């Protein structure tokens, strides 16, 4: 339960960091970039 709380925190900080990396990406490639990079986060949260 303690570790399942730390994992939730780690997904929030990675969705925040994703948003910040996506700000700089131009507004045509921004869809593809979030789709690839969101899946990668789902995976790293399942893994954990």
């Amino acid at each position: 339960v303690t570790r399942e709380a730390q994992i939730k925190d780690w997904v929030e900080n990675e969705l925040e960091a994703l948003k910040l990396e996506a700000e700089e990406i131009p507004s045509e490639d921004q869809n593809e970039f979030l789709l690839e990079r969101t899946r990668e986060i789902h995976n790293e949260a399942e893994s954990q």
Binding site: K8, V11, E12, L15, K19, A22, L35
Partner: protein
């Protein structure tokens, strides 16, 4: 095969938080793992979820995933305002965006902060529920 429905839903939600889409308002991101929701623990549910939510959630194919969707939305709204969770109530209906409406101290603290509209996007699958609340003044 690689980009399932939950990845599309959750990229849309992250896309609508960029400065060009919406800016100058309270932004609250909250994720919950669905395994953190015990639906058997009736005390946690009754204390933090209204009877309209409980009857909507419990009619779904994955009760646990839907309750986590709601709980993520409530905590996403509370982070957006910036101030128990019973007060915030998420009115979700099928294939439509859910509406937020406040009741108790949350409604008071929304008039104190001067918040008119609170929109909330939700996505939930088998692992986690992600909610993004945008509170425009």
């Amino acid at each position: 095969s690689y980009i399932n429905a939950n990845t599309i839903e959750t990229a849309k939600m992250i896309e609508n938080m960029t400065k060009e889409k919406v800016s100058n308002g309270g932004v609250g991101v909250d994720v919950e793992l669905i395994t953190s929701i015990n639906v058997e623990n009736d005390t946690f549910i009754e204390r933090n979820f209204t009877p309209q939510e409980i009857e909507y959630c419990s009619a779904q194919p994955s009760v646990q995933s839907s309750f986590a969707g709601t709980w993520s939305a409530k905590e996403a709204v509370f982070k957006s305002l910036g101030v128990a969770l019973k007060d915030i109530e998420i009115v979700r209906v099928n294939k439509n965006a859910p509406a937020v409406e406040l009741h108790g101290n949350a409604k008071k603290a929304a008039e104190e902060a001067g918040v008119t509209d609170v929109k909330v996007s939700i996505s939930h699958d088998d692992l986690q529920a992600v909610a993004v609340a945008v509170s425009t003044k």
